[PDB]
């Protein structure tokens, strides 16, 4: 009866019936799915006993079509998460194939733990393995319904947080050793320096240098456990975790601005490419793509043995915009730094006239 | 409800990690914990 009510509800939605004693329906349908509807409609009218087959006329109007996405049991959770903010228009690039990986990845960097990564995915594999008998029961409160709707989202969240939990140890804030700890060079610091007088008294928590005999090899997979047992732990981590956060922030936003090209080269609108893709990828490489290569350059160049007076990336990012160059507090990071940086700002400066003034010529 | 079963594998592996790493204090806390809280895993079904 609930089917028959639905068919009689959509026949109310059907033709004004003024034209003939027949029903006309302007339905939307996928173009590549068109053989299956015609094969069904040809035998659908056969059950009624009619010798007249119903026909399907294709229109060429200008009403806006709806969107449609091929939806699986897995990618439905990542689809409606994107669809909650805004429905996609006709033939825009769906970010949902990219949201499958990047959104559990961006969750895992800010929720990174091996121990909580175990807890998240073991709850997740319980939700998907027993999912037949859980779905058999009708309906429950909102702390089971949204959780069951995202059982595959929380699966990839628990898997990736195990991996990013290995990049920075942090298994219930504890750590593991996999053929490592090769920073903590005890002997060399004290053997090559003074051992016992220093053990108690003047120092209770004294620092290690890296250039006596101490640091050999940077822990082949993750953060070495010597930081977690130290007391200066955060000043290395907040130096690390702030740089990598803006490293991931650019190349994710660079990946977004490169997809604006494929939304303009498909519409055959070459006007939009010459002010939308070209100056935007120059504006982000000059200001922000230059920032991520300064993080890589400072990381490899300077070390513990030389260069205690190492420059800071906060001040040198300011001297790009506030054009004052020449100071003794912060040295240049590399030779010819004054010449390349003024060139990078003016080509970021003139992009704002180039984007603005040349597009309204329509 | 069965949260004690979650308490097994975490406290078993914690006892192993204290067995590795004077060291006799680390073994004393280890042998006290997984022999007893693993023994306290007797819970309802």
């Amino acid at each position: 009866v609930r089917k028959m009510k639905a068919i009689y509800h959509t026949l109310n939605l059907c033709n004004i019936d003024v034209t003939q004693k027949c029903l006309i329906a302007e339905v939307w349908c996928p173009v590549t799915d068109l053989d299956s509807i015609q094969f069904a409609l040809r035998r659908g009218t056969e059950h009624s006993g009619s010798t007249v087959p119903s026909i399907l006329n294709r229109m060429q109007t200008n009403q806006t079509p709806p969107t449609y996405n091929k939806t699986n049991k897995f990618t439905y959770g990542f689809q409606n998460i994107v669809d909650a903010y805004g429905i996609g228009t006709y033939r825009e690039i769906n970010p949902a194939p990219y949201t499958i990986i990047t959104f559990p990845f961006l969750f895992a960097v800010m929720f990174g733990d091996l121990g909580h990564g175990i807890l998240m995915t073991l709850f997740a594999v319980w939700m998907v393995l027993r999912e037949s008998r859980i779905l058999s029961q009708k309906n429950e409160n909102e702390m089971f319904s949204t959780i069951f709707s995202g059982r595959y989202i929380i699966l990839l969240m628990g898997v990736f947080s195990i991996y990013t939990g290995l990049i920075y140890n942090d298994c219930f804030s504890k750590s593991l050793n996999i053929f490592g700890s090769s920073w903590s060079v005890r002997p060399m610091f004290d053997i090559y320096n003074w051992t016992e007088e220093t053990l108690r008294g003047n120092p209770v928590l004294q620092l290690n240098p890296a250039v006596t005999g101490v640091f050999g090899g940077p822990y082949p997979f993750g953060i070495d456990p010597i930081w977690n047992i130290a007391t200066n732990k955060l000043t290395f981590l907040n130096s690390f975790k702030m740089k990598m956060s803006v490293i991931l922030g650019i190349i994710h936003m660079l990946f977004g601005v490169s997809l604006s090209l494929f939304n303009h080269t498909y519409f055959k609108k070459p006007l939009n490419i010459y002010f939308g893709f070209i100056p935007e990828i120059i504006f982000m490489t000059s200001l922000f793509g230059y920032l991520v290569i300064l993080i890589f350059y400072k990381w490899t160049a300077y070390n513990a043995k030389t260069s205690e007076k190492a420059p800071s990336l906060l001040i040198h990012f300011i001297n790009m915009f506030l054009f004052s160059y020449g100071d003794s507090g912060n040295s240049m990071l590399y030779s010819g730094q004054k010449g390349i940086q003024c060139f990078l700002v003016v080509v970021a400066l003139l992009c704002v006239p180039w984007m603005l003034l040349f597009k309204p010529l329509v | 409800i069965v949260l004690s079963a979650w308490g097994v594998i975490m406290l078993i592996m914690l006892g192993i990690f204290f067995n590795v790493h004077q060291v006799s204090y680390n073994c004393f806390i280890a042998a006290s914990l997984y022999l007893l809280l693993g023994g306290f895993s007797f819970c309802q079904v």
């Binding site: 120092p203 928590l205 004294q206 010597i226 930081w227 732990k233 300077y302 | 004077q22």
Partner: protein
């Protein structure tokens, strides 16, 4: 070196993945996931060591703990 070991091992998954994939309806999704998961987990591993390689610091270790760490490493 760990860098040359993992680069070809992350150069296997996501290159040979687009090559060894079923012809089912999920082919496009599977390839995308190999491409992505490859470019995320490699560069995450890349900036962790590079922010270790050529360091400027040392672990500020407490008292007892320093001799204790000599005994074990």
């Amino acid at each position: 070196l760990p860098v040359v070991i993992f680069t070809t091992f992350w150069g296997l998954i996501g290159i040979a993945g687009p090559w060894f994939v079923p012809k089912g309806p999920n082919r496009g999704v599977i390839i995308t996931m190999l491409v992505a998961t490859a470019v995320c987990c490699y560069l995450f591993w890349l900036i962790a060591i590079l922010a270790q390689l050529n360091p400027l610091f040392g672990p500020q270790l407490k008292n007892e703990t320093i001799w204790y760490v000599r005994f074990l490493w």
